[PDB]
Amino acid sequence: SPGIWQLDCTHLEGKVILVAVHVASGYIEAEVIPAETGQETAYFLLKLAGRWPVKTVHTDNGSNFTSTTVKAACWWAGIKQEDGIPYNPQSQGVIESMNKELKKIIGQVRDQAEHLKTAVQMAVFIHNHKRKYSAGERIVDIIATDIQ
Amino acid sequence: SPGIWQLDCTHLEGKVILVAVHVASGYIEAEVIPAETGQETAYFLLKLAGRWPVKTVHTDNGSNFTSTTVKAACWWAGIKQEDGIPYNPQSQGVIESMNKELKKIIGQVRDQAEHLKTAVQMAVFIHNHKRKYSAGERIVDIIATDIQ
Numbered sequence: 001s002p003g004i005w006q007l008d009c010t011h012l013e014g015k016v017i018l019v020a021v022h023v024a025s026g027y028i029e030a031e032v033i034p035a036e037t038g039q040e041t042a043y044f045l046l047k048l049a050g051r052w053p054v055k056t057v058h059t060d061n062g063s064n065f066t067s068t069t070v071k072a073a074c075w076w077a078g079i080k081q082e083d084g085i086p087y088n089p090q091s092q093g094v095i096e097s098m099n100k101e102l103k104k105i106i107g108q109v110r111d112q113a114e115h116l117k118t119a120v121q122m123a124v125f126i127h128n129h130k131r132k133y134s135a136g137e138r139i140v141d142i143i144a145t146d147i148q
Numbered sequence: 149s150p151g152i153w154q155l156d157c158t159h160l161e162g163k164v165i166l167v168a169v170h171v172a173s174g175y176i177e178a179e180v181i182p183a184e185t186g187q188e189t190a191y192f193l194l195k196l197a198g199r200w201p202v203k204t205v206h207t208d209n210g211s212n213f214t215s216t217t218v219k220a221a222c223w224w225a226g227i228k229q230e231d232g233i234p235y236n237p238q239s240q241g242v243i244e245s246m247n248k249e250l251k252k253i254i255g256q257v258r259d260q261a262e263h264l265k266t267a268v269q270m271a272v273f274i275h276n277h278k279r280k281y282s283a284g285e286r287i288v289d290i291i292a293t294d295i296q
């Protein structure tokens with residue numbers, strides 16, 4: 001569980017926001033892309049796995065699960081690719097809630113940024129720093145504990 | 149010192165690789181950009197600060213130090229912007245060594261990627277996972293200790 005992430009794709013302003021959530025902490029990384037292709041997803045996962053110890057990824061849909069490019073990236077980065085089928089429905093809803101929460105934050109900052117990508121990164125910042133401990137704190141504590 | 153990062157800009161294939169190094173661990177994040185502008189640097193810092201607790205940034209040159217856009221991003225993200233003047237001279241060399249080491253790794257993977265950006269993210273991955281403990285391990289341990 002320190003190494004488990006979930007992909008999530010949501011839409012805003014005719015664009016796609018691709019999100020990776022560290023399941024145990026709620027910590028996220030996100031990017032804006034024109035559309036969700038295997039290529040974009042593969043590149044995003046490579047970035048993520050270089051930055052955090054990504055062991056398992058629950059893919060967001062069957063197209064990405066099937067994608068040979070995504071499979072190649074997962075092989076390259078040592079990621080076990082899994083389906084994102086919510087066998088525990090606290091996952092349809094927990095994801096929905098995150099997308100709504102992120103879009104809320106994006107709207108709160110949207111006027112401060114010319115470009116959506118900037119607003120999205122502002123939202124990532126606010127989300128990961130928000131004391132509820134913060135998600136940023138939780139992920140670091142979880143991984144440090146695992147390491148030792 | 150858990151919050152201190154250093155910017156570093158290096159060149160390859162007519163492109164620019166912008167690197168942020170967490171000084172205490174050697175952990176890096178990096179991106180390829182067409183050229184090093186205040187706008188690109190500001191966006192890069194926003195991304196970084198959303199993902200790790202960036203307190204202080206030693207900027208890579210005076211243009212970025214001066215940039216009103218970089219200053220705005222640093223204000224937004226709660227980053228103290230500092231000059232990157234190596235008052236402890238082992239620093240120009242430690243950066244030079246990192247750039248040479250990253251370019252070496254990039255050359256070792258370059259053939260596996262159509263695009264330089266992919267090779268750069270492969271290099272980030274290899275760099276942060278390399279046992280020497282790894283840089284990824286060191287940054288997490290340093291921050292977890294600080295938090296607690």
Ligand SMILES: NCCCCC(=O)N[C@H]1Cc2ccccc2[C@H]1Cc1ccc2c(c1C(=O)O)OCO2
Nearest residue numbers: 111112113114115118187190191194217220221224
């Ligand atoms: N509408 C207000 C105009 C902003 C003037 C100004 O300096 N803003 C800061 C605020 C702020 C706050 C955090 C980070 C960057 C920025 C800058 C914006 C910016 C910079 C770089 C970018 C951007 C944009 C963007 O504006 O999206 O896009 C991709 O690279």
Ligand SMILES: NCCCCC(=O)N[C@H]1Cc2ccccc2[C@H]1Cc1ccc2c(c1C(=O)O)OCO2
Nearest residue numbers: 039042043046068069072073076260261262263266
């Ligand atoms: N056999 C038919 C095609 C094989 C190609 C193939 O799947 N390579 C993997 C290897 C590999 C290893 C790690 C991550 C991605 C990739 C993929 C490459 C790739 C994917 C997405 C991208 C890229 C590139 C790129 O090539 O730079 O650029 C920006 O977004």
